[PDB]
Amino acid sequence: MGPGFDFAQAIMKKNTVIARTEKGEFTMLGVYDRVAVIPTHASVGEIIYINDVETRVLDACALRDLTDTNLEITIVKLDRNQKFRDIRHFLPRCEDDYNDAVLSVHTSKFPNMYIPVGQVTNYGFLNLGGTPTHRILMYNFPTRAGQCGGVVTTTGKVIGIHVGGNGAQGFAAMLLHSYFTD
Ligand SMILES: CC1(C)OC(=O)c2cc(Br)c(O)cc2O1
């Protein structure tokens, strides 16, 4: 409908796949080469389904900060025959607050879904499902089961992936450029 939705659509149309694990179907953001991200609660194994194709997992790393605190981001390298468009230059370098964000989801349950969530707070610490978690972003939208892995964008920046909610607020794990240096 406007330039926020334009940037979100550009990311969804080229840089997402549908990931299926034993714990469900997730929006999965591809970042560069065969490297993608997914919430750590997806419990990625040795094999994952990518757009309903059986795919070997070459590497999976559940990220923690240097306090050894959960970040809820797993970086996955996929044995796929095709590379993602490199979007690392759209990742923030530092922790920050944002205005006017969009949460975008693409699954069998929620195809082509875009939500204007408004202001995003650098919330920091969250007890997420009983697990102490750092680098959480918060938005005041009643997000629901099925939106985990959804991409959080502003115009020109990919800032997080949706990892939970409490019925009134939604919570995303930050994406930082430093997670994807090589
Ligand atoms: C009520 C409650 C906790 O129920 C869910 O199952 C749920 C899942 C996601 Br994902 C979310 O953003 C928010 C949610 O709200």
- Looking at 84, 114, 142, which one is the last position of a domain? 84
Expt. technique: X-ray
- Please tell me the total count of domains within the chain: 2
Six token digits for residue 75: 């970086």
Q: Burial-class residue 122 by CB neighbours within 10 Å (0-12, 13-18, 19+).
A: middle
Task: Round to whole Å and give the CA distance between 17 and 55.
Answer: 12
C-alpha of residue 83 to centroid of ligand 1, in Å: 32
Residue 162 designated active-site:
no
- Ligand 1 atom, smallest distance to 145 CA: 8
What is the resolution of the experimental data for this entry, in Å? 1.4
Do 172 and 129 share a structural domain?
Answer: yes
Q: Is 109 left (phi over 0), alpha (psi -120 to 50) or beta?
A: alpha
Six token digits for residue 139: 């938005």
Please list, in sequence order, all residues whose beta carbon lies within 8 angstroms of the beta carbon of residue 84, skipping any fewer than 6 positions away. Answer: 14, 15, 30, 31, 32, 33, 34, 35, 36
C-alpha of residue 163 to centroid of ligand 1, in Å: 9
Residue pair 92/157 in contact by the 8 Å Cβ criterion: yes
Task: Round to whole Å and give the CA distance between 30 and 142.
Answer: 26
Task: Give the structural domain span for 90.
Answer: 1-15+85-182
Residue 41 designated active-site:
yes
Residue pair 103/160 in contact by the 8 Å Cβ criterion: no
Do 29 and 8 share a structural domain?
Answer: no
* Residue nearest atom 13 in ligand 1 by C-alpha distance: 165
Task: Round to whole Å and give the CA distance between 29 and 84.
Answer: 9
Phi, psi (degrees; rounded to nearest 5) at 69: -105, 135
Contacts 24+ apart (CB under 8 A), 39-46: 39/72, 39/73, 39/74, 39/148, 39/149, 39/161, 39/162, 39/163, 39/173, 40/70, 40/71, 40/72, 40/73, 40/74, 41/72, 41/129, 41/148, 41/163, 42/74, 42/148, 42/149, 44/74, 44/76, 45/21
Do 55 and 92 share a structural domain?
Answer: no
